């Protein structure tokens, strides 16, 4: 009876083997499918140029991340470009929209930039003074600056400035422009008579102001604006437009919601009250001839 009982196993041992041979062949096929990395949803586009307009001019048709290398810069760096249906390419250098990024930073972080760049432009960030200075001071060609605000109701305004520019670190990345070009958000950069004093308007204008951080005061105040308000900005004594301020949820805050009592929110006086912090903010530049030529 053993003849069958013993030969029964042989038919199985040799069965398992041929199966193993085939199983190892499939394990090989699987390996071929597990060599690539996870696919990253954020991609940087191939096209590059001096600025975002140079890139649009070359044919780029979608907003996102591109490398730019301003005429005199040592290296290329990443920026978010806004390319519209009309071939206009804006280089965005500031963005607020949810208060996830802390804008209370030092001189170097404002110089080098901070925050994150996203393809869909849904992140907060500060490009960096050095990069803004490099872009805006390339070979003669005036840039135009556009401010874009949005309240907590869905309303939005804008404010343009001709011949926008930001100087080198030696001059504290001073801010300059030739004049207000227009916009329904108002020209807050020219100051705003807050009422508390007649000289308010004069002391709260920004054209000509150097940049200031808490650890590097270059304002026209004997105190420290940047430090008191918790931001980086072209402070006077102190400000009228303050896009790098504290992100107050809802838009409305009071002298009580602030540490020093000073309105340090995302403000733009000529359009809203100092006690109303914007919901979204965006500062971007483009060659001037591009703005309705």
């Amino acid at each position: 009876t053993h003849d069958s009982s013993i030969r029964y196993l042989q038919e199985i041992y040799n069965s398992n083997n041929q199966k193993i041979v085939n199983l190892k062949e499939k394990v090989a096929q699987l390996e071929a499918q597990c060599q690539e990395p996870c696919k990253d949803t954020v991609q940087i586009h191939d096209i590059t140029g001096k600025d975002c307009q140079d890139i649009a001019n070359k044919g780029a048709k979608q907003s996102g991340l591109y490398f730019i290398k301003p005429l005199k810069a040592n290296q290329q760096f990443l920026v978010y470009c806004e390319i519209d249906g009309s071939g206009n390419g804006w280089t965005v250098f500031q963005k607020r929209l949810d208060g996830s990024v802390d804008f209370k930073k030092n001189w170097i972080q404002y110089k080098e930039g901070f925050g994150h760049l996203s393809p869909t432009g849904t992140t907060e960030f500060w490009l960096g003074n050095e990069k803004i200075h490099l872009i805006s001071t390339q070979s003669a060609i005036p840039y135009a600056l556009r401010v874009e605000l949005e309240d907590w109701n869905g309303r939005t305004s804008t404010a343009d400035y001709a011949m926008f520019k930001v100087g080198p670190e030696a001059d504290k990345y001073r801010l300059t422009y030739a004049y207000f070009a227009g916009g329904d958000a108002g020209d807050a950069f020219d100051g705003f008579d807050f009422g508390d004093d007649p000289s308010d308007k004069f002391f709260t204008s920004h054209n000509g102001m150097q940049f200031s951080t808490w650890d590097n005061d270059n304002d026209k105040f004997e105190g420290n604006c940047a430090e008191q308000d918790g931001s980086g900005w072209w402070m006077n004594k102190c400000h009228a437009g303050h896009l790098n301020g504290v992100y107050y949820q809802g838009g409305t805050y009071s002298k009580a919601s602030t540490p020093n009592g000073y309105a340090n929110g995302i403000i733009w006086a000529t359009w809203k009250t100092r006690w109303y912090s914007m919901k979204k903010t965006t500062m971007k530049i483009i060659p001037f001839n591009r703005l309705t030529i």
Binding site: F194, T204, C238, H239, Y262
Partner: peptide, 4 residues
């Protein structure tokens, strides 16, 4: 804002 302004300052005293």
């Amino acid at each position: 804002g302004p300052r005293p």
